[PDB]
Symmetry: D2
Subunit: 431 residues, 4 copies
């Protein structure tokens, strides 16, 4: 049992608490779309862990490559190259759109965003960074400074030159023009104010294609194209953080492929390492060349380490060969329709949004007031778990609590149905 | 051969350059204290890669544990605990000095420093951070803001409230009192100026016990105790970054054990993961408790992931069982004496310093002017490599180029001698 | 003649240029509503100089008091009090609304805003300052940081924690709700974004009742009350800068009297000194008391100097006795109707706004496109001058050039008519 | 009597407290080197008020010019020139050293420093400002950011890029080289640390030739020349604030004339206006030209107002004609010798320093420990006043309380002797 009192005593005495609460169970093993507790109870992992287990837990091919390299090529001095690094950088150039040529292989999501923000700053000679008011880019300095969905209070000033604009949120619109939510006029209005505040040092805009932590908010039609133009007109780079959207989760290899808008710098992480710490930035030859001339520096302990790179290479291979990107659309369709049926059944489901296998379900009191259903969100989450379904709700100011659903791309038809099943029971048991 | 033209073509076309130059060889395998090129030539790794391969490359026990977990427990949702995390946190509490009780398990060195700086800020309600003018804490925001040995230009303002004081450097003293280098009076003088500048928001002092990037500068007798008092008197936390000194490299488990001065927050990384991305902060129960009450947040993708934690646990086990800490003293003694013999032989060796298996050799023109030997440092480094010896020189303003020597704790008597041998030839071939 | 070549040679060789251009004439004397050139030509001063000559130039009573004190009590050590200082502070308490009790007597407008911003910061323990995107508070540090109508580029970062929100501008509305310009919803939307960006250190909102430099933009009905509530709800002080609106110009002693909303800190300057350097902040007994306990400091060379204070006292006396505040309404009405007749005559006049003797006339191409009439504004200004009428146009981004009309409160019916006359000719001569 | 209870009641109810305490007397008139209370008691003004009454109080010629202009030319629109402005700018060019050509005429000391700091920033494209740790430049934003003798706590962060270095203080030396206070090596050491911290944006160094608020600390022989070289080598402008030293007080017209080191920008204020609010910056034609091309802006209400300018012109005339600069040396010599005799008499006088009529007397417990004489300083100041002598002591961290003596340049032999007399009695009455 999950109750090993020595265990919980040690957890309590020697762990730093870092946000949230610890689930009251001890996870002993993981395989495919499931995690197992100390009792042996299978818990269906509908979040792919911290949204990273793209191939589910302990994928045989992943296990193999890790082994293969653990005992062959592990970690190196950062000036030394090896085959997996060059292979992975080459693959990344080949599968991203034209205009993205060169890669930097790192360890975490925040790290990737920091390296990108640092390069933008260097290359432009400027320093002001603009993000969305509901963003999530990481916990480290610059990454945190561009993060507005949370973490801004009680920890000192933010980086000098930080600005946010409101993200286009079709569910709860707030900017109108002629009895219509004009998200493009909102965007124009947002930039006007930025322009007035700027000290004349706008360097970059950083954005997630779909704001995950912010509540599964998809940038609507024409937006990204509009945003890139605002940047271009101002001499700003556009940095696209696809930590959650990259590597096939939304139905395209990269979310940016859907709009056909290619960013100046693309950052990847979570999905790319398949549970392991691996991340990257991909930029154009022109930008890298200039950064170089200018003395760009981002030298860390694990930059270009062979083991993680070799894992990333295998992840890409499997995704391509097994057509997991298409799979994402087919399974997402099945999952989405299921959620729509629940929404038919239950009045507390106010919205079902997202794309491919990055879906959001917003819980509400009144499907008309769209009044946030406080409390409800958490009982649901609670019953889900009892029922054997791991869910994650995010609760932000002014909107209803949002369930972030993101199962492995290797998820089965059956697992999807099990999830829908459990979720339905959790809801009815909760009201 | 190392000349695979497809290889180098791809490196050139698809890699972002991040500082330094790429060594012109392709590393194919690694084992023990050696790395092997495409020709099969063994290169003796006197830097333990990027100073992380504590047990050398591809250590059998490391290989085993990694396997064991790759296929059993890999990556999890950050609210879920598992045995390796609790075991590792518990072990860390047990081997660090009294006053360090609770741990946070992360991925990189900069990340660990960021989490520590963020906690200090939260817990004090303040935000000014003081570091050494020759420090190296990482490339991310806060960590970079506290980094003065390099990286400060062309990338925008630093974090608000950043200050540096000079580090005590006995080789090139600059503060006297009665014809004597009084490093404690220097420290007093340094703080006086800080006091005058501060806005009244001093939160923490961050320091490396031995400044590695800064040139293997060991804080001298009584200093740390003196520094901790300056902090205490000001309501500041002392954060000790043992990324390079921790886990037995200096001859004690933690460098802080040598002085008997225990920091408020201790950060670890490099050595702890043995090539893999794992890092941590260890703080006192009191500080963690307050951070908690205050809402401390540092939630990342891989915080508390089982695989890396399980690796860290094994590293600690092996180090303890095989008495690698003592080994560090015995091998360091042998290595140090060798360097002193070279210094007898060659006039260009101006100083041999450091502790245990973290040694520095400062190259000079004139052992009296102590004039930096420019050029010389790099030919040497160059001949070393030809000779089959991987070395790392750091070149900072006002001092002679420094070789940073830090072989695996598993290094053999023979490997040490080989290194001394090659280094002697490299020198004579270089002048 | 205005052509003294020695004069212009010296101007050119020894004057620092500080914005704008120097009018090509030499002003020799000034009296009442007129300035006279070297030829003796009278120029009607429709801006009261730099909007400060409330009683016109060289008012006999002003001349008398200045004399009276020049030779009696001039300048003192800042710890020494005198009668004019106490009298003036007492008068200010008596004529401002209830809740404003204590005064600080300074020298310039920016200085007054700095002293107020510094007190807000002290008293709240916070530091973020919010202003309007079209504001003008001064050229010095904090005052400039809160200034968005201009001056923000090429001079380094602004003060940490500076934010702006859009000012409610009824002429060119940009925020709608149900086919209506909802300036209160705009205000709500503005604050929401602020809230998301703030580091949790909001100290004050600083505002002009009528944005003068920004284009004579009057805060519309209910706005100020709404703004004060936003502040209150956030623990922020409201600082009202009446440099241009105070001391009867708008038809009330203080513009804030019109809305019946009393600020936490009121700042005055321009009008108060009647050409001379005198300014002030007025705050509540509670706020002063706390600032005091906290060690508030704003010690300058001329704080509490008797001469300027004695001038300020006389200005208040004359304004009260001669009923210049009412006069402002009667003359403003006459002036306003005149401008409306011109607007009937000329299509280029798009708007006539403002209050009392602080009026604005916005020049446009098309009274429907409301397209800014570039060029036109400046010819007009140019012909005015030839014609003997001193005008001031302000040209800001996205709106038509604005003439800022603000004659002395002592202006005569005849002078008003002369002004209207000349202005009409200037216009027809200009198109 | 000074006891008018209505008076003190109003002071208490309606004055904002701004530092220090109000002297318990009501000053009714002032003339020459004296101020008179409500009882008619003459108080000898040994500080020239707030160190501004260069010609003493209510100087007949000053009274005349003020009158002359009050009723002739008072205040103007800032784009309009007049004779006094051009005359004063021309005179300033003529009496300052070669290399200072163009002037900007403002209102206060802080304002002048702000305009200078803003121009340096513009012209260099940079923003970091370096000052002395014991400086005093004013209460407004930038000026306050460069002020380290006080005011830095409880009011939020300082301007981004603020640094201080220690000022050379021969009385209490703290940097040695070979048993000698090497203030030049101290300077070298100071800059080294700056260099390491800078983000590569050093714009200017701002300094007082003699730190007045800091304790009458005269920059010693060769220092300024050394400082200017440090600046030059770094592409930094040197701004010299002669608010207290300018216009003959030290025995030369400008203190900078003594060392023969001409600054890039010179700022003046206090003395220049002779009690009235007038200040200025003087820079080179080259710097003004560039600032101009770059769009320099510093447009205020009273910039270039004729009245104050006309006063400044007269002050310069009188100083020149009556040879007040030489007078400063002769009277300063007499005053200095007197203080040295007191120091012979009393053990509590530890040092007598300064130059011309800007003298400092440091009070100590032990003329050997040089232990600050707390309490003593204030009784003395207290008895002085009873005795009829207005003195000002400044008390800073680590040094003994300092009396700042600075009588009018028009002071008589007799007044000097009276002062010495009273001061001697005050001392003996105090111990
Ligand atoms: C003392 C110290 N702290 C923190 C770090 C940052 O660790 P990272 O996040 O890069 O993994 C480094 C890295 N030391 C490096 C990094 O590159 N070269 C060095 O000598 C370090 O030496
Ligand atoms: C869009 C996005 N970018 C960057 C990151 C940072 O990656 P890290 O450095 O933490 O590995 C996150 C993390 N997303 C998280 C982190 O915790 N919960 C989330 O939903 C993210 O969602
Ligand atoms: C060197 C110096 N510069 C600038 C200023 C600022 O002038 P303000 O704007 O205050 O007119 C001061 C004021 N010195 C003061 C101010 O109060 N007490 C002093 O000893 C000063 O001593
Ligand atoms: C609303 C407002 N506040 C403060 C100030 C600053 O006063 P200063 O320190 O310049 O005496 C100004 C100056 N208004 C100006 C200054 O120049 N042109 C204007 O229309 C102002 O309009
Ligand atoms: K590496
Ligand atoms: K995790
Ligand atoms: K005063
Ligand atoms: K003016
Ligand atoms: Na590509
Ligand atoms: Na411990
Ligand atoms: Na009142
Ligand atoms: Na000159």
């Amino acid at each position: 049992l999950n109750d090993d009192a020595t265990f919980w005593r040690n957890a309590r005495q020697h762990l730093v608490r870092y946000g949230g609460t610890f689930e009251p169970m001890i996870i002993e093993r993981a395989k495919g779309s499931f995690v197992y507790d100390a009792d042996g109870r299978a818990i269906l992992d509908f979040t792919s862990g911290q949204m990273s287990a793209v191939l589910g837990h302990c994928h045989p091919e992943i296990v193999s490559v890790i082994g293969e390299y653990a005992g062959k090529l592990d970690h190196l001095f950062s000036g030394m190259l090896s085959r997996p690094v060059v292979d992975l950088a080459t693959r990344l150039a080949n599968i991203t759109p034209p205009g993205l040529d060169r890669a930097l292989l790192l360890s975490t999501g925040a790290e990737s965003n920091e390296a990108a923000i640092r390069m933008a700053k260097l290359v432009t000679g400027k320093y002001e960074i603009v993000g969305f008011a509901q963003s999530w880019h990481g916990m480290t300095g610059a990454a945190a400074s561009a993060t507005y969905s949370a973490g801004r209070k009680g920890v000192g000033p933010a980086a000098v030159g930080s600005f946010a604009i409101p993200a286009p949120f079709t569910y709860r619109p707030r900017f109108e023009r002629n009895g219509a939510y004009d998200y493009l006029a909102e965007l124009d209005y947002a930039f006007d104010l930025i322009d007035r505040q700027s000290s004349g040092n706008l360097a970059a805009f950083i954005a997630e294609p779909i704001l995950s932590s912010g509540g599964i908010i998809e940038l609507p039609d024409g937006y990204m194209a509009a945003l890139k133009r605002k940047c271009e007109a101002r001499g700003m780079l556009l940095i696209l953080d696809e930590a959650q959207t990259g590597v096939g989760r939304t139905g395209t290899m990269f979310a940016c492929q859907r709009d056909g808008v290619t960013p100046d710098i693309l950052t990847l992480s979570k999905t790319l390492g398949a549970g392991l710490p691996l991340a990257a930035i991909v930029t154009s030859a022109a930008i890298e060349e200039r950064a170089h001339e200018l003395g760009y520096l981002f030298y860390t302990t694990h930059v270009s380490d062979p083991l993680p790179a070799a894992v990333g290479l295998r992840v890409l291979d499997v995704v391509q060969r097994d057509g997991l990107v298409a799979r994402a659309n087919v399974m997402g369709d099945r999952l989405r329709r299921g959620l729509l049926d629940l929404m038919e059944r239950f009045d507390c489901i106010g919205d079902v949004r997202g794309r491919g296998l990055l879906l959001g379900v917003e819980i509400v009191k009144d499907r008309r007031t769209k009044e946030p259903a406080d409390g409800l969100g958490a009982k649901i989450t609670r019953e889900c778990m009892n029922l054997g379904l791991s869910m994650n709700i995010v609760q932000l100011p002014g909107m209803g609590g949002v369930f972030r659903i993101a199962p492995p791309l290797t998820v089965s038809e059956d697992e999807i149905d099990l999830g829908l099943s459990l979720l339905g029971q959790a809801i009815e048991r909760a009201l």
